[PDB]
Every structure is written in structure tokens, then in C-alpha cells.
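Our collaborator T.R. sent over the components below with a one-line note: 'Predict the complex.' Nothing else. No constraints on interfaces, no templates requested, no preferences about which chain binds where. So this is a plain run: every listed entity goes in together, and whatever single assembly comes back becomes the starting point for the next discussion.
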Amino acid sequence: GLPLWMGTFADLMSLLMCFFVLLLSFSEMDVLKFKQIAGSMKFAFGV
Amino acid sequence: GLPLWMGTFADLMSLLMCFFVLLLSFSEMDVLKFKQIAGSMKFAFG
Amino acid sequence: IGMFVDVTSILIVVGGSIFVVLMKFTMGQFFGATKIAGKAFMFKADEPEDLIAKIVEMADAAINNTFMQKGIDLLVDGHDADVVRAALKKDIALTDERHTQGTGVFRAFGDVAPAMGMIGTLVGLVAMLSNMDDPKAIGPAMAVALLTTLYGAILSNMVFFPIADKLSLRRDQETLNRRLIMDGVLAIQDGQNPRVIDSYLKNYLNEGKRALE
Amino acid sequence: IGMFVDVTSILIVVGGSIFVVLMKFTMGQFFGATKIAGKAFMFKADEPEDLIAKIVEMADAAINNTFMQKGIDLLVDGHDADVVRAALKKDIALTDERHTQGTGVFRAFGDVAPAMGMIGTLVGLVAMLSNMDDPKAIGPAMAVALLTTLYGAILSNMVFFPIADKLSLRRDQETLNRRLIMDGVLAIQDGQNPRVIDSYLKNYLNEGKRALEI
Amino acid sequence: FVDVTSILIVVGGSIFVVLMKFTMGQFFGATKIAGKAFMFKADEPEDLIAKIVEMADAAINNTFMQKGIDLLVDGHDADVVRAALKKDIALTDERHTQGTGVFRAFGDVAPAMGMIGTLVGLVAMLSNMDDPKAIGPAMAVALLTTLYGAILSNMVFFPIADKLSLRRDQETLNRRLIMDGVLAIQDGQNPRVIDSYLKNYLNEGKRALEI
Amino acid sequence: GMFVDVTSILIVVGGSIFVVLMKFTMGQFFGATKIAGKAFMFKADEPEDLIAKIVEMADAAINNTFMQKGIDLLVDGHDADVVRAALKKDIALTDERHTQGTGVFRAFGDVAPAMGMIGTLVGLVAMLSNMDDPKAIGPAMAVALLTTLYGAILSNMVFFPIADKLSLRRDQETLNRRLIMDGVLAIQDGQNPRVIDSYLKNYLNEGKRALEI
Amino acid sequence: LATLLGLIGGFAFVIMAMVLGDVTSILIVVGGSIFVVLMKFTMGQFFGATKIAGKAFMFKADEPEDLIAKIVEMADAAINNTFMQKGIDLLVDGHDADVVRAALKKDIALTDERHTQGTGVFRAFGDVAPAMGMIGTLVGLVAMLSNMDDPKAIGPAMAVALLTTLYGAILSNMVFFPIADKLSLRRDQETLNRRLIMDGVLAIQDGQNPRVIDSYLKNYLNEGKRALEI
Ligand code: NA
Ligand code: NA
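Returned assembly:
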């Protein structure tokens, strides 16, 4: 079976993700930052 | 042990956390809303 | 609100764990497990070395321990070997049974605590996400979720599982001590040499976890 | 209130759990398990100490428990000791197997509920992601996914598994009560005094789970 | 949602791993036994008991019962027919257990391939970030992989394995009842006592609830 | 570009290798690799072919290492005890070797997803710590995602299927060696070809092969 | 290829170590793990397990081939190894075969129990480390949320709390569990060596033929995990 602490790990991961959803609920998108992120991720994945 | 659905849940949850961190990396947060949220958290936690 | 969140989280975790466990064990069973845990935590087990010394002391002549007192009472009543051996084995099995049931009760608590933590986290997260436009509600919901997860983890890993492990360790120690008393009483009834039985009982001192030399 | 109620989510969880469980249990077996749970929850088992007093109460003379009712009925009809022993042991085995099957049904339900919660939260996440141009109004969309997961967790941990655990506890209480009546019924047929049986009837009263009480 | 590529990925990965575990002939046999357990119905024990009682009164549709009768007619002792029937029962039990194992293996391998497919889709999307508005919907199709695996791991493969195990238990009960009837027939025992003995098998390890 | 791929491969593969080398020595790992390579590029001898060969020698009285050992041991050792003991010893050696190889690959497949999770956590920590450098979060997400993907692929598509194939090869080799041992015993006892041919029929449809019939 | 595997394993361990090191985050994990572990094992038992692990990691076990060579040397005749010297002294002082067998079996069982206890202690540590890392992460999250002042600090501080969780994993899968596995391997190696020594001592005392006992020793060498190396 799974480790006994995997339930708490899923709990923590969900808690963190929902905190990030809350943070994004009042966020504002930036286009230049998005372009920089896209370029960096293209560089990272060898494209 | 624990049922494997818990492991699938944990993997999916960590995946979603990673992508949401990516989303918020290039997002700008409102400062007034952030101050309100911080005050609410501070009052809730003591 | 600040104390309301703590009260709600403690209620969720502890009340859910208690409700789930009481459907598995009777309230008398739960109180017996609590009593045996308190006994194993507030009392030190008798050293097998002192038991060996006392046993060879009475063997040379041929009593704070209750099992030893019962064995001596059985021996002094002129009973045959089979009856006394069966009675001592029955007492050993009874003690093993109580300790195993207490370990099971606290293990049940241990696996139920994180489930209640997960349930409270899901409740708090749903309340936060639905009430996004009300800042006064996202705070207490986040606090309830985080604190219920933290309380579940702390109770499962630092309270209930270590208590179950301590109960199992005390069960092993009590089983070893009672087996030592049984062997000493059987040797006294047989009337063997004190040195031979002393060596045979000292052979027990390297059994299991006692390998700390 | 309305944030914890969703028709589609509860539909997914309950329909999936029922559909998967019916792949192993017919509808009649499921209804028998539900009847078992209702009997075990709405009724309490007779006290074993109260059973012993009642058995010896009718011994010198020579009624609420149906098992002892059957026992005294066969005693009045005067069957042999073998017939009574076989009938009572068959009834005991039937009750034990029936309770075990009810426990298995509810354990299967509790095992399959959180898997359907995971499936429903995956569906909700897909629905949320197909409609997110910007991450602003995704709170109430994640609400329904976490709601399906919450339904699965609550049903598994606080409804189905406790019922399966209560059914195991009832079986142990029933088994002890069944054995006490069987031994008591045999004593009446033999013709023994009320006091001799009481010496050995209470020897194994604290058996298994009950060992913690003493 | 519906995506041919995602279901193809999940099915192909699960098939590849199972073909690493079992062989193609074993997989086909498991599919055949699952189809026979689904589209057909096992004979009720009551009908079997009635047929054996009728045969005892006079002294045939089930293949096991036909084999038992054919072994009984040609002057064969109890030991040989008992051994043959036990061998047939063991073979049927082994076939059903193997089918259960194949479908269980499919069940535990489906969600891993769902996760692998969704991760591959995520990497492919992150390596081609062009429009922000298409970042959200993208995981949808990627997540369509994982969901499928979960569904296949909880609504198809594991239910089929459980149905196969239930059919295995039912066939074991029916064949044991037929064997007991045959052993009673060769003994020439009275119809009423053997009827009672066979009805004593009605409250088996799963039928007690319906009583 | 290369840095993040090399870092993910480092984390996953190197962690798996380090843990397994802690478990198994390098020579044992190379033996397991040899066993897997032999089981992947060499079809197991068909049992029907073995039965045909056995009845061919039985009627009269190569191309198989166990058969060569059997004939060489029969041509000198007249007693059946030594030959049976040697054949059983070889069977047990092959079974143990295949079991050890399966254990090695199962250990690899168990440890890989742990390294994937560790890499995900490392990438998450880096991404959260920077959160303002575009050139720093691209590599971090690459590391996290690629560690998870590599762990899943290695555990579910490489190591576990290799262990399962090794188990299948162990079963096939055990059945073939049992058939050869039974044929050697029959040719020692001078049994009729027909009775042994019928006696190996239940040997044929054993376990996995029962589905084909 | 052995050098390549050793180098890649060492490099993975090194990069995980520099990821580990930072001082407080590991301190919480180790303190919680120690506190929970000491409810099952005393302080003396914990130090005994640590000593056993250190001995197994620093020192190397004697090769069974050298043991066979020494055994056959003494068998044909009629030692730095402690167990071999003890057996030689026991058989040369004058005793029955049963006494020597009992003493050697008692020592073998003692070593087996010691290594099993060490393995159990380190497996308990590996089981309890991730939970304590997670608890530290949750405490850090609570502190961060109750001291929430700057959005720019939401990211980094979060990464600090999650750091604790990472350490737990890095300690569970790469320190404690490998140590327990190495302890099990050392237990198997020492059990094989001591069984070989006992068989050789019995053969020398009983005056058995050197060839048959040598073949017996090879048969002993050709089993266990050692089968993969042949
Ligand atoms: Na992503
Ligand atoms: Na990931």
C-alpha cells in the first residue's frame, strides 16, 4: 500500500493549490511577463 | 497502507499546484485586495 | 472568530475521530484502552534482572509482583504442574489480549485523525472558494482547513501512533517478564540448581530489543 | 447551505458507487444488508447477563428473544439433542454469515465511494479548465470538484465504514448471545440444576473485545 | 469530454504492460471468459437440486452434470469420478482466477498511463506557449487522459474482475453441488435426504442475505 | 535546455541507482541485467517441443543446456538419487536467480517515483523562491515536470514490466525444467512413452497457460 | 560500467546533500523524528543502532572465499577474525560438539537480532521523517499566514516552509531507508560468514574429509543474493 502519510501529503498539496487559486482570484495578467515565461520555458524544454 | 486513489489525488494536486504557481508567476496581484486578505487571515489565526 | 476557528477545527478532528472509533469499539473498551495507556505511560516496567535475582533468591530457599505472587500462591497450594502452567499461560494470553486491543484502539484513532483532517480541509476550501468576494469569510475558512490538517497530522503522528507503539513495547516487556516468571516458577517446582536456572533466565536478557550491549 | 449541495456531484458519487457495488451484489442482497443495518442500529442487543438470568428463570418452572423462542419450541416438540444442536448451530452460522455479508456490502460501498469522488473531481477540474481564459472566476468552479471529493470522503469515512464496523460489533454481540442460549437450552433438556451451569457460563464472558473492560 | 487520442493512449499503454505480463492468447481467453460471465447467466442452484432429485427418482443440461452422468453410466467407482470432477473444478477455478488477475492488472495499470499521458500533454503544451487564453483549456484535453484511466480503473476493469470472481464462486458452488449429487447417486441414497443435503448449500457464503 | 534535462535525469536515475546499490551489490545488479537481457532476446523453449524430444529419446532408449546436463549425468551416474538431487539443485538455482532479478527491478521501480516526487518538490521550492525571474522558473518547472514524467515512465513502462517478464520467464523455465526432470526420471524407470505423455498433459496447462485451453 | 554507476550515485547523493544544506528546517525534522522514535527504542538502543550502522558503512565484511581458504588451511593442518578465533579457542580448550554448536548458534542469533534491531530503528526513522517534515511545513504555513504583510514575500516564505517537507523526503528515501537496507545486507553477509565458520569448525572438530566440506562451502557460496554473480 501507500505510505501512511500520503493522505496528509495530498491534504497539504490541495491546501497549497487552493491558496494559489485564492491568490489568482484577485490577480491581474501581465502580457510581457507571460512572453518572458513562454520564452524561458521554450528554452528549458529544448525547443 | 492507503488506497491508491489517494496517491493519484496527491499526484494530481501537486501537478495543479505547479501549474497555478506558473500562472501566478506572471500575474500581478491587487494590493488593496491583498491587504484585505492579509487582515482577514491575521484576525482568523489570532 | 479566532477562537471560533480553533474550536471548530478541534471539534471536527477530535469529534469525528471519536465518533468513528466508538462505532468500532465499545465505550468500555475505549476506557480500558485509556487506562492501559495511562498505566504504560506513568509506570516503568519491572527490570527482568531484578525478577531474575528475586527468582533465584526464592529458589535458593526452596514479592511485589502480582503475577509472581499468583504463581507463588499456586505453587504453595500443592497443585500439579499442568494446572499451574495452564493458569499462567491463560493470564499471559489475557494480558496479551488487553494490550493488543489497546494498540488496536489507538491505531484506529491514528488512521481516523487524518481522514477528519482531510474532511475539514475540503469543507474549509469549499467555503473559501465559494465565498471569494467576501474577505471576512476566506480567512476563517483558510484557518479552519489549515488548522484541521495540522491537528490531524499532529494527533496521528505525535500522539496516537507513538502511544500505540508504546503499548506494543509494554506488551512485549510484560510478555517477556511473565514468561520469565513462569519459567522461574516451573524451575522452582521442579527444584533445579539455582545456578543453572540463573543462567537459563539470563539467556533471556538478549531477547528482542534488549540488544543494546 | 447551497455551496455544499450539488445535484450533479451527488449523482455522480452515488450512481457510481451503486453501479460498481451492484457488479458484485444483487439488489436483494443489498436490501438484505440495508435491513441488517437498520436492525442493528434501531435495536440494541440483549444483555448477556440478562440472558443468563432468564434462562435459569424458566429452568425451575419446567419470553422475548426469538432464538430462545425457537429453542423452547423445539424443546416442547421434544426433538433429540442432536436435532436441537444442529438446528441452533445452523441458525448461528446463518446469522454470522448474514452479518459478514452485510459488512462486506458496506465495506465495498465505502471502498468505491472515494474513487467516484476522485472521478467526479477530475470531471469538475476538466470543466473548470475548459472555461478558464483568466484565473479570476475559478473559485466556484473548483467548489464543485472539491464538493465531489468531500462527498466521497464523508460517505466513506462517516457513513459506510462506520456501518460496516457497527455490523461487525453486532455480529460479535450476537454470537456471544447465540452461544449462551444454545448452551442454556441444552442444559434445560438435560435436566440440570440452575446453579451448575452458572459456574462455567460466565468463564468466557470477557472474550476478545470485552477483555479491555476488566 | 470525448477524445480519441487520450483513450487510445490509455488503452495502448495498459495493453502493452499487460502483454508484458501475460500473453496475447491469455488475454483473449480472459476476454472470452469475461464475455461468457457477462452475457450468460449461471444456473440457479435450486434448478440443479431439482434436476438431481428428479434423476434420483428416475434412478441433463449442465456440461458438468453431463460429464458426471457419462462417468457414472460406464460402471465407474466413486474414486475415479470424484478425481475427475475435482480436476475439472480446479481447472475452472484456475481459469477464473487467471481472468481476474488479467483484469486486475489492467485496473492497476490504467491510471498510471493516464498520468503519463497527461504529463506528456502538459510538457507539450508548456513547450509551445503561444496564447494565454489557450493555456487553461489545454490541460482539459491533457486531463482527459487521467480521467479516462480513473474511469477505466474503477468502472470497467475492476468491476469486470469482481464480476469474474463472483462468477468463479457461483461456478464453484454449482459444480460442488453437482459433484455431491453425483456422489449421492452412485451411493443410491434416498431422494429426500439428498434433497435436504443439497438445500443445506442454499445459504452459502453470499446468498445468506436474501434469506 | 540541456541543464534541466540532465538535472531531472540525474535526480531520478541517480537516486534510483544509489538506493538500489545500497540494497544490491554491483555484481548482483549486473547479474540481474544479464538475466533480463537473456529473457528479452531469447524465447523460452516450448513445452510441447520438450515433450516431443523426451518421447523421442524414450523411443530410442541436444539444443538445450539442461538436456545436455541430463544426458551427461545419466551416461555416467547410474543411480537416480544423485541425478535427481543435481537437477533439483539446478532448478532451485535458476528459480533463485530469476527471483533475485525480479527483486532488483522491483526495487528500481519502487524507488523511481519517490525520486520523481523529490524532484517535483525541488522544482516547486525553486519556482516559489524565485517567482520573479523568468529565466529561473522555466528551468524549475522543467525539472519538476520532467522528474515526475521520468519517474512514472521508468517505474511503469520500464522496470515493472521487466520484473513481470522476469517472473514469466521464471515460470516458463521452472515448467520446462520440471518437464525435463520428469522425462529423465521416466527414462530412468523405463516408463512407457504413452503413459508419460499422458502424465505431462496436466503439466502442460498449468497456471498461466490454462486460459489458452 | 560499475565506475559510471558509482559516480552517478555519488553525484546524486552529493546534489541531494547540497540541496539539504537549511539548518533549522532539518532540525525540526530530526527533532520530531527522534522524539517519536524514542517512544519505541531507548536512548541506549538508539546509540547501539547508530554504532551498528557506522560499523556497517565504514568497515567491510570479510570475503567468504578467504574464509573458505582459512577453513581448509586449518582442516588440512589438523586468525584475525574474532568469531573464527573464538570458535578455535572453544574447540581447542576441550569441549563436546554440542557445546560449540550451541555457543556459535547463540552468537549468530545475537548478531542477527542486533542487525534486525538496527534495521527496525532506521526503518522507523524513515517512516516518521516525512510526517515531521509535513508538520513543520504546516506550522510554517500557519506562521506565514498569520504574519502576512507583503505580496512579494508570499512566494519565498512559502518556499521556505515547503523546504521542510523536502528535507523529510530527502531523509526518508536517501538516508534512513538506505541505511536500513545496508544493515539488512550486512546482516545477510555476516550470517553467511558465521554459518560458514561454524560449519568449518564442526568439520575440523569432527574430523570430516576436507574435500566434501569444501564442496559444502561452495554450495553455501552459490546461494542467496550471490546467485546473480555466478
Ligand atoms: Na502544468
Ligand atoms: Na509535476
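Summary for T.R.: Helices of chain D lie at 7-21, 27-42, 48-61, 66-77, 81-129, 139-190, 194-201.
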